[PDB]
Amino acid sequence: ELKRLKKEQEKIREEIEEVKKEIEESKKRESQKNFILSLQLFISMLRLKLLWSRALALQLQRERLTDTDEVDRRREQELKRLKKELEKLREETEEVKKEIEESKKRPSLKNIILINQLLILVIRSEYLIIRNLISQLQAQKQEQKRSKKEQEKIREELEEVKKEIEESKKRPSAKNFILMAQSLISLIRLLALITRALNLQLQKRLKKEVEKIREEQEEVNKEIEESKESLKNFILLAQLISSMVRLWELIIRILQLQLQKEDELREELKRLKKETEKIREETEEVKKEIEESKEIILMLQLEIAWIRSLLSIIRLLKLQLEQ
Amino acid sequence: REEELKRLKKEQEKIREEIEEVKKEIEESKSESQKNFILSLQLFISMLRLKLLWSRALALQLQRERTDEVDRRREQELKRLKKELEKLREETEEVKKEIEESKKRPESLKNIILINQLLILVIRSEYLIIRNLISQLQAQLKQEQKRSKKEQEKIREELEEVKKEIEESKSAKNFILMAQSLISLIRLLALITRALNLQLQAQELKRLKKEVEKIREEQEEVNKEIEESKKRLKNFILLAQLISSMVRLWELIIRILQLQLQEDELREELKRLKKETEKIREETEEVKKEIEESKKEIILMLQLEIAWIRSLLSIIRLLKLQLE
């Protein structure tokens, strides 16, 4: 079955490269900067999901057969391949990252920068999720410490960022930044708990910290629907993140049950299995809502790929439920 | 002009007999593995003869742009190439069968068999490109585009066919490095045809740039994997570096095509090719040294690999000379 998904990764990698190559042709030719600058992070996120998709396929086939290690053999080599693709974004992240710094040292537009920082803050964190999990397959402590110190370096950036937001959220359209910003803030806050979980897979309170994120993002999503021209494509962008939040809350929800792994965990299974569909449904509802919308030109391409890459993981995740 | 293109179209001969001697020796030498390795020599031999023709068909296109006799000479060589073109596609079908016979006999050689299956499809895809070039020269006709597009999808399914039986099996680490280096090269050749056919229609070429950049990265995945297999059979590795340079060369061919399509935006990506052409020339002679250094199919393998280096370099020059 999995090799069916192992085609879309190329198919998603397609518009990645051209819209990545369409980016720097016009990077030759203050707003258009950070419009270009944002799309690049979207791509660095798009590839990040493809890495995470291949990572999930590894665990899935890790469990399909594990009598001896010819399953592990095909694994350790691919473990290096995706380990590299991590750093190929780590460099690409650097480029955009420093083009955002010196973009601040210049005289709506001022708040676009903040979302990009938030965007980076998300990429920095999904990173360590992968690096953790990527290494948790060479073992089958030279990995724990880096995320502990780094989980501080994101939380320290995340603090200063969120304070420079409420400073203007109290102030006098672009209020839809607030939602996407708030949605990203909840995403980082939610993703911070997942690193606590992935390192617990190595070396309980988060189930309550999750419910804090849940009911808080629930109110952004309600406002999201209470708002559905120019910014109307930007609300769709926000509903994208909303699924990423709900998807990630779904991921940790799997991260408990296998710890407790003899029946009542098949009820949490059925629970997952439905909300597995519920996001993928709400995701494909977005897919139609994206399709309708006809720099903008290039944004909608990545979103479709952002959808497809997300669906491939959901399609790949519901198979982890059979596990 | 001809002085340059004569001292080039003399090295073409200087290679052709080194092939036909390896050739006359092949059937002279002709267990199962031995007669299987013999096949790969012929396939490699045919690959070489395809290169010389490919270079010969190029120099034509040059003098063309460079006299009544630049048109009388047209008919002359184009037929001479078309003859050699079809003589090539002959011998291939026979080898294709002899492998189809050996597959049914069970046995690490199924590696060596699988690579032979790829080489055929590589040869098969290269054919339609040379014809796309030669027929474009004698066109100086709607179905000639289509048979190339038709025999393309015929190779396409056989690629995935053989691609299945690759994963359905997966030292051996290198066979796949080499096998993947070929699959990519095949996926590259299919682009050039669809790119060439796009020339006759004259904005779809955006789909090409995508897939081209796709095959850029994945090739550099195998390219880097090859690099560390040297630091830890040596003949097998340098031969895999032969294939990787082909993917680079053909990448440049495609890059030349998409530029041949559509004044500093021109000169921008233009000198990139001329700069890229300079890179491939030395990389080729890098493989040349290690073959020339590393001194019974082995020697036949070597002289074949050397002649390929010399043959490829002649194409690099015409490409550089074409870039003006």
Side-chain angles (χ1 to χ4, degrees):
Chain A
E1 158 61 55
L2 289 323
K3 194 62 188 179
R4 179 251 279 185
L5 292 175
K6 306 312 135 191
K7 308 168 179 55
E8 322 312 310
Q9 342 271 211
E10 159 156 73
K11 310 302 147 53
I12 310 152
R13 270 254 280 264
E14 299 225 13
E15 3 75 10
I16 286 190
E17 313 309 324
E18 185 53 39
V19 186
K20 216 173 188 302
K21 280 314 188 68
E22 197 72 16
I23 274 172
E24 18 233 69
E25 162 80 78
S26 341
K27 176 55 70 69
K28 300 169 160 60
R29 326 272 172 78
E30 74 292 0
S31 64
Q32 201 154 292
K33 299 188 174 190
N34 300 272
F35 294 19
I36 291 165
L37 284 168
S38 261
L39 292 140
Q40 304 186 219
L41 300 169
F42 220 110
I43 297 181
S44 221
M45 249 165 297
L46 262 169
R47 313 172 66 76
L48 212 58
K49 288 125 190 165
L50 312 190
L51 272 61
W52 167 264
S53 69
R54 303 165 223 275
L56 286 199
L58 292 178
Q59 181 282 129
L60 203 53
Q61 296 128 68
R62 165 211 64 82
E63 184 55 45
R64 278 195 129 179
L65 304 93
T66 326
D67 295 69
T68 37
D69 62 1
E70 256 280 318
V71 40
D72 303 56
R73 284 325 90 198
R74 222 143 324 289
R75 168 216 310 282
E76 324 295 351
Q77 49 94 358
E78 295 295 338
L79 279 170
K80 316 151 187 171
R81 305 209 185 201
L82 326 177
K83 150 79 180 57
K84 224 226 300 300
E85 259 283 27
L86 265 172
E87 322 309 315
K88 316 187 84 54
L89 324 179
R90 189 185 83 163
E91 314 312 286
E92 173 50 36
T93 310
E94 288 171 338
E95 339 258 347
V96 187
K97 154 74 219 319
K98 291 121 62 180
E99 302 164 54
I100 295 175
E101 299 180 358
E102 285 80 59
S103 279
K104 260 166 298 196
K105 313 180 185 65
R106 313 295 159 240
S108 167
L109 267 292
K110 46 260 187 293
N111 323 113
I112 300 178
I113 277 289
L114 325 178
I115 324 291
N116 296 271
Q117 308 179 225
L118 284 164
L119 284 168
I120 294 181
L121 286 180
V122 179
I123 308 174
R124 305 159 42 105
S125 348
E126 297 169 292
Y127 269 156
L128 338 159
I129 287 289
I130 311 157
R131 293 141 184 186
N132 285 278
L133 141 74
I134 282 292
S135 59
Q136 306 169 214
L137 319 176
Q138 346 268 115
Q140 318 177 19
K141 215 193 181 193
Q142 311 85 313
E143 159 61 26
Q144 306 257 231
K145 276 79 56 181
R146 45 156 288 283
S147 273
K148 326 216 177 313
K149 88 193 71 144
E150 162 82 317
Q151 197 169 209
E152 313 281 67
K153 317 311 183 220
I154 334 173
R155 80 169 164 75
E156 290 190 276
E157 244 184 88
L158 177 58
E159 285 151 22
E160 307 176 9
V161 165
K162 75 157 200 55
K163 309 155 187 163
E164 302 164 11
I165 282 184
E166 319 144 0
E167 167 242 318
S168 42
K169 177 166 45 197
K170 59 153 161 80
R171 293 174 64 257
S173 181
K175 175 208 181 183
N176 300 251
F177 285 57
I178 299 170
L179 329 179
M180 176 171 308
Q182 199 88 40
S183 321
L184 286 167
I185 296 162
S186 60
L187 182 54
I188 312 165
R189 290 193 266 111
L190 147 78
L191 274 156
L193 334 166
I194 322 182
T195 272
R196 251 81 58 100
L198 273 199
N199 295 133
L200 266 184
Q201 304 291 99
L202 277 6
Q203 196 245 17
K204 315 186 310 302
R205 110 215 189 194
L206 282 316
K207 238 183 193 175
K208 299 91 174 184
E209 295 198 39
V210 150
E211 302 173 64
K212 171 56 56 59
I213 313 300
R214 298 174 81 102
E215 281 71 80
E216 281 198 3
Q217 183 76 65
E218 281 175 355
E219 305 161 18
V220 199
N221 306 328
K222 291 184 289 278
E223 142 79 64
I224 268 174
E225 187 61 63
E226 292 282 317
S227 54
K228 273 153 67 175
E229 302 286 321
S230 49
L231 59 147
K232 248 66 199 312
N233 302 2
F234 192 86
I235 271 291
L236 229 181
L237 212 185
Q239 276 238 284
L240 295 205
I241 293 130
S242 177
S243 154
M244 270 272 297
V245 185
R246 189 182 193 188
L247 174 91
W248 271 122
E249 255 101 7
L250 194 96
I251 313 305
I252 330 165
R253 275 182 50 172
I254 329 166
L255 271 167
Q256 306 113 209
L257 272 318
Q258 97 287 323
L259 233 86
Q260 292 85 287
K261 205 285 205 189
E262 49 275 2
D263 258 0
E264 52 255 52
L265 68 103
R266 83 163 188 174
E267 253 84 343
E268 347 265 304
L269 236 181
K270 292 171 199 165
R271 289 166 56 234
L272 290 185
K273 280 140 72 277
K274 272 123 237 182
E275 346 294 342
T276 294
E277 316 303 323
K278 303 320 161 192
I279 319 163
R280 147 249 183 281
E281 293 152 2
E282 281 184 342
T283 311
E284 275 182 313
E285 315 315 296
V286 157
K287 178 247 299 191
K288 167 226 272 186
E289 301 168 274
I290 297 182
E291 222 93 57
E292 206 288 330
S293 309
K294 96 160 184 293
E295 331 302 303
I296 330 98
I297 32 206
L298 296 199
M299 196 79 262
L300 315 160
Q301 270 103 50
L302 308 186
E303 304 216 359
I304 292 290
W306 180 99
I307 301 287
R308 302 157 40 102
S309 65
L310 170 55
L311 305 170
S312 55
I313 283 157
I314 310 168
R315 167 70 207 190
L316 191 51
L317 270 165
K318 53 191 62 179
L319 310 177
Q320 290 190 9
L321 305 171
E322 313 172 358
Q323 223 76 89
Chain B
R1 165 85 290 103
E2 49 258 43
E3 188 285 316
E4 178 65 72
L5 306 190
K6 282 168 177 171
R7 105 147 200 273
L8 297 204
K9 289 185 133 182
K10 282 188 191 64
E11 300 291 336
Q12 305 305 299
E13 337 300 310
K14 298 186 182 208
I15 299 168
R16 220 267 275 202
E17 309 89 27
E18 210 221 66
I19 305 180
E20 277 208 345
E21 272 308 89
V22 173
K23 208 158 178 290
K24 292 166 191 168
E25 125 81 33
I26 273 168
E27 326 92 7
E28 157 109 30
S29 298
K30 203 170 192 175
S31 53
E32 48 267 355
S33 53
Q34 304 168 359
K35 285 145 191 173
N36 204 126
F37 273 48
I38 290 169
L39 301 162
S40 304
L41 299 164
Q42 322 162 216
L43 271 138
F44 197 12
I45 268 203
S46 146
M47 274 277 307
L48 295 201
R49 319 193 67 163
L50 209 42
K51 276 309 170 303
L52 323 179
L53 245 141
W54 172 218
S55 71
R56 231 179 328 283
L58 273 203
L60 295 174
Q61 176 197 23
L62 276 320
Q63 326 130 354
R64 170 259 165 281
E65 330 258 51
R66 164 77 213 103
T67 300
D68 76 295
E69 204 57 36
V70 88
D71 308 300
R72 331 270 76 89
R73 227 175 289 99
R74 264 177 159 100
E75 275 201 49
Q76 302 161 13
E77 175 96 288
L78 296 207
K79 281 133 48 224
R80 295 180 287 173
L81 300 193
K82 118 86 201 168
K83 302 166 189 179
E84 298 238 1
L85 256 195
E86 314 308 324
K87 297 149 42 188
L88 267 143
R89 183 192 163 280
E90 235 147 74
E91 123 87 352
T92 286
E93 304 224 42
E94 279 63 13
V95 182
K96 161 178 59 190
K97 298 158 197 175
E98 304 161 53
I99 298 169
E100 285 168 321
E101 313 206 14
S102 183
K103 289 222 64 175
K104 310 309 169 293
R105 346 223 180 285
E107 41 101 65
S108 90
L109 330 175
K110 263 49 190 172
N111 290 285
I112 309 142
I113 292 187
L114 267 170
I115 305 299
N116 282 137
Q117 310 171 210
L118 286 157
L119 301 202
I120 283 146
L121 320 177
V122 179
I123 296 177
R124 292 192 55 200
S125 5
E126 277 206 19
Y127 281 154
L128 333 185
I129 307 181
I130 315 292
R131 308 154 185 176
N132 268 283
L133 207 101
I134 299 180
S135 187
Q136 259 165 54
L137 303 175
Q138 57 87 8
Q140 304 168 353
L141 289 177
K142 184 187 289 184
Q143 250 91 342
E144 312 223 21
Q145 269 21 260
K146 301 195 287 290
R147 177 131 99 91
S148 74
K149 191 72 223 72
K150 281 184 294 187
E151 313 307 326
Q152 207 74 41
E153 316 299 78
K154 167 87 80 169
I155 304 161
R156 172 164 51 67
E157 321 287 44
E158 274 36 49
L159 161 73
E160 296 103 36
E161 265 237 13
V162 180
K163 175 156 186 166
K164 301 161 182 63
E165 311 150 44
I166 291 169
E167 288 132 334
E168 293 270 335
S169 332
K170 161 197 63 60
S171 127
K173 184 179 185 178
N174 310 118
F175 294 83
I176 323 297
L177 283 170
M178 163 166 285
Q180 183 47 241
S181 304
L182 289 158
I183 297 154
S184 54
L185 185 61
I186 299 158
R187 298 177 282 194
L188 207 53
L189 294 171
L191 297 157
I192 338 176
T193 301
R194 306 193 177 108
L196 264 164
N197 300 343
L198 272 174
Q199 149 190 4
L200 288 315
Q201 185 57 59
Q203 25 62 52
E204 154 75 323
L205 66 146
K206 287 82 173 184
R207 225 203 42 67
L208 273 141
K209 314 227 188 217
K210 303 186 180 281
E211 197 77 76
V212 168
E213 289 135 29
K214 235 80 42 215
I215 308 168
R216 284 219 77 171
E217 326 139 19
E218 318 154 13
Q219 199 51 58
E220 270 68 275
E221 301 188 44
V222 146
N223 269 309
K224 206 68 192 61
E225 211 329 275
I226 294 174
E227 299 189 20
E228 312 306 285
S229 300
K230 329 212 64 212
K231 312 177 177 182
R232 272 90 279 255
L233 201 272
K234 163 67 62 180
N235 163 236
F236 198 66
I237 324 176
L238 318 178
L239 182 53
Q241 295 164 170
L242 287 205
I243 308 182
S244 174
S245 58
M246 282 286 296
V247 195
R248 303 185 69 110
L249 161 84
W250 277 120
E251 139 82 307
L252 189 50
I253 301 279
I254 297 188
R255 274 209 67 180
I256 290 179
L257 293 212
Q258 309 147 311
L259 266 307
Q260 257 183 263
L261 206 151
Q262 320 89 304
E263 197 59 29
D264 269 295
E265 153 79 290
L266 163 106
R267 225 106 41 82
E268 188 180 77
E269 308 303 294
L270 209 167
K271 58 181 300 306
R272 294 237 43 77
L273 320 174
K274 278 144 69 176
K275 172 182 293 153
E276 240 298 329
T277 333
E278 290 306 313
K279 291 152 182 166
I280 314 179
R281 190 204 67 82
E282 304 177 25
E283 302 154 8
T284 308
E285 293 182 0
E286 290 310 306
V287 191
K288 184 198 287 188
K289 253 159 301 307
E290 200 159 348
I291 311 166
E292 291 155 333
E293 272 197 342
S294 40
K295 292 111 166 177
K296 63 169 198 165
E297 35 61 54
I298 27 181
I299 312 98
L300 260 217
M301 173 110 46
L302 294 168
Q303 312 171 203
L304 274 163
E305 295 208 58
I306 284 299
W308 182 91
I309 298 291
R310 323 157 93 255
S311 172
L312 188 95
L313 293 162
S314 50
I315 324 168
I316 311 301
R317 176 56 173 180
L318 289 153
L319 290 166
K320 196 65 167 60
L321 296 182
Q322 176 184 357
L323 282 153
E324 305 121 21

